[PDB]
């Protein structure tokens with residue numbers, strides 16, 4: 060009657076290859092408070108913020124506790140994930156066994172096999188049987204459920220919450236075009252009828268990558284060299300002139316020369332949202348853009364925007380679910396690794412960290 | 425009879441030391457159209473925007489004409505100055521001989537001895553004879569009149585038009601603390617009861633400069649080294665936290681490390697206005713300020729804000745005039761050079777351009 064679980068913890072900040080370890084703990088299914096719930100993990104991803112959190116440079120972090128049975132206070136890892144409800148308490152009515160859920164708050168700890176929480180720690184997603192019962196053509200996959208709460212919401216809110224782009228006319232431009240976030244943004248731009256330019260780094264198979272992004276929804280795809288080119292500017296001005304619209308919004312997750320390049324390409328009174336810094340270079344803007352072109356440069360942080368705005372989180376999440384159920388939105392694919400007990404859980408996540416350069420990593424159970 | 429006048433012109437853009445020259449022309453005082461007026465210059469300053477215009481890097485320029493009697497099209501120089509009305513046409517009623525005026529629009533050309541214009545090309549200021557007859561305790565000086573239309577309005581509008589600072593609590597921070605604009609900003613901060621920090625470059629007489637800026641109205645004065653110091657940081661945070669207010673607004677006219685320094689000192693949701701670039705370095709902001717502190721970076725250009733908002737221009741100007749007449753506001757002093765005919769006019773402005781590092785230069789007549 061006792062469940063054995065595993066959790067990935069750390070007692071001090073550092074590099075994941077140095078500080079992470081696995082802790083065994085036990086959950087009692089026969090002694091649940093009226094409002095308590097037991098969930099079983101189906102999958103959880105490795106995202107850049109999860110790593111910064113372990114490193115000690117992310118300013119939103121779970122508290123360290125002895126709640127997993129350690130002598131020293133330890134913090135769990137992972138902020139998003141997909142879970143299946145095993146059992147509910149006497150007073151729980153919003154959930155039942157077999158339901159799919161995600162955490163309702165950050166800092167929950169998702170790099171583990173099981174969790175004990177209250178009903179209000181979770182948000183219910185439709186599982187495939189419930190989607191089918193409502194007549195929808197598709198139900199979510201594990202990867203779509205386990206990654207729905209961050210990257211799709213980031214892309215949707217940056218496109219719709221700050222500048223109103225006229226459908227069929229106006230443009231946005233984004234760097235980091237091959238990222239998971241960049242790929243959701245191209246799809247959402249397409250579904251809302253926005254034009255867009257994606258900036259990516261050059262590669263030998265460039266033609267296949269351009270074709271993939273255009274199928275996802277980018278209108279044009281350029282390299283960072285063309286982004287740096289004064290000779291190439293006029294052709295970007297011509298794209299925009301023929302649409303009848305303006306370039307009003309810039310999305311930056313790189314920094315450095317890349318952030319300067321996409322800023323220069325906006326029309327007057329443009330806005331840039333910085334949500335990332337993959338290059339480790341700061342944002343650099345010439346003085347003449349601010350004064351003579353009325354350029355504005357601001358920030359975006361989804362964790363801080365949704366803290367006390369449940370309504371905005373809910374309706375954005377419902378729109379993403381609806382697009383998945385109708386087949387109009389596809390997920391950024393993951394490289395999956397199944398935990399089966401022959402290898403400590405913390406080493407699967409250490410491998411995911413080390414191989415993130417190959418693309419988004421997902422641990423499944 | 426016939427008035428012989430002099431004007432500083434150029435036929436192509438370039439460095440002022442290379443392209444400027446003096447042109448003689450004649451104004452006929454006996455044949456004035458009903459709405460024309462003749463003015464005689466009393467003083468006109470050398471401002472950074474005047475130099476950029478001559479260089480060809482400022483996107484607001486007077487047209488080149490042969491109206492001064494040149495065979496090739498030539499442009500005049502200078503955007504602000506103080507003039508005295510010599511004569512008015514039959515149908516002019518808003519001005520009379522003896523009045524003090526400034527240009528009502530940019531690109532008028534103020535580096536010259538005389539001008540012929542329409543009544544509506546000018547804005548009337550009270551001269552000292554009129555201040556005294558109207559019972560006011562003080563009247564304008566030449567230097568106060570010749571510099572009233574730009575730098576005092578810039579300081580006022582940056583402090584009141586973008587963020588509402590709570591009197592007696594909130595702070596703003598500015599670099600370029602010894603500039604003319606910086607000094608008007610300190611005085612307005614005192615008159616509106618805003619707290620402020622001024623950042624200046626170190627000097628041998630630092631203590632005397634600090635005393636002067638505190639007398640003008642700055643709450644604290646720091647050097648660029650302290651602005652850059654990780655160790656001095658905590659002392660600036662205490663000044664603000666102990667006041668009960670927040671640092672909401674940063675004013676940047678330097679660029680480079682200096683703009684990074686003052687941005688780091690703001691509370692969350694801070695705003696920076698870039699209105700200058702004296703260091704010729706771009707604005708550089710760490711990615712973490714945009715994301716984790718919700719920092720925003722924008723521009724300010726007074727010519728464009730007041731272009732079609734004459735009501736806001738008028739009321740801002742009237743407030744500065746009132747403060748001068750009541751003795752509550754003092755001018756940023758200038759180094760003055762008198763034109764007397766023994767030395768071509770264009771060489772006085774060439775010397776003024778070259779000596780701008782010594783402080784604001786004013787040519788008087």
Ligand SMILES: NC(=O)c1ccc[n+]([C@@H]2O[C@H](COP(=O)([O-])OP(=O)(O)OC[C@H]3O[C@@H](n4cnc5c(N)ncnc54)[C@H](OP(=O)(O)O)[C@@H]3O)[C@@H](O)[C@H]2O)c1
Nearest residue numbers: 107213237238239240260312334335336337338359360361
């Ligand atoms: N502010 C927020 O709320 C928030 C929330 C979630 C995620 N984010 C941010 O969004 C960004 C992307 O997240 P993600 O989950 O989509 O990660 P991801 O799937 O792993 O994609 C990262 C991409 O960045 C590109 N890249 C790496 N180094 C680069 C460099 N030096 N220059 C240019 N491009 C580079 C890579 O492109 P290549 O194919 O060329 O290698 C890679 O595909 C990150 O900066 C992340 O922190 C922000």
Ligand SMILES: NC(=O)c1ccc[n+]([C@@H]2O[C@H](COP(=O)([O-])OP(=O)(O)OC[C@H]3O[C@@H](n4cnc5c(N)ncnc54)[C@H](OP(=O)(O)O)[C@@H]3O)[C@@H](O)[C@H]2O)c1
Nearest residue numbers: 472600602603604605625677699700701702703724725726
């Ligand atoms: N956007 C607008 O609407 C607008 C309108 C008017 C003026 N402005 C701008 O406002 C700024 C000040 O104008 P101003 O008329 O007051 O000029 P100013 O009186 O001549 O003052 C010049 C200032 O620049 C500083 N400085 C010069 N070179 C520097 C460097 N390399 N590093 C750091 N500081 C440096 C000087 O400091 P020191 O004492 O140490 O030499 C001084 O404080 C200018 O950049 C001007 O272009 C903008």
Ligand SMILES: [Cl-]
Nearest residue numbers: 552556562563
């Ligand atoms: Cl007097």
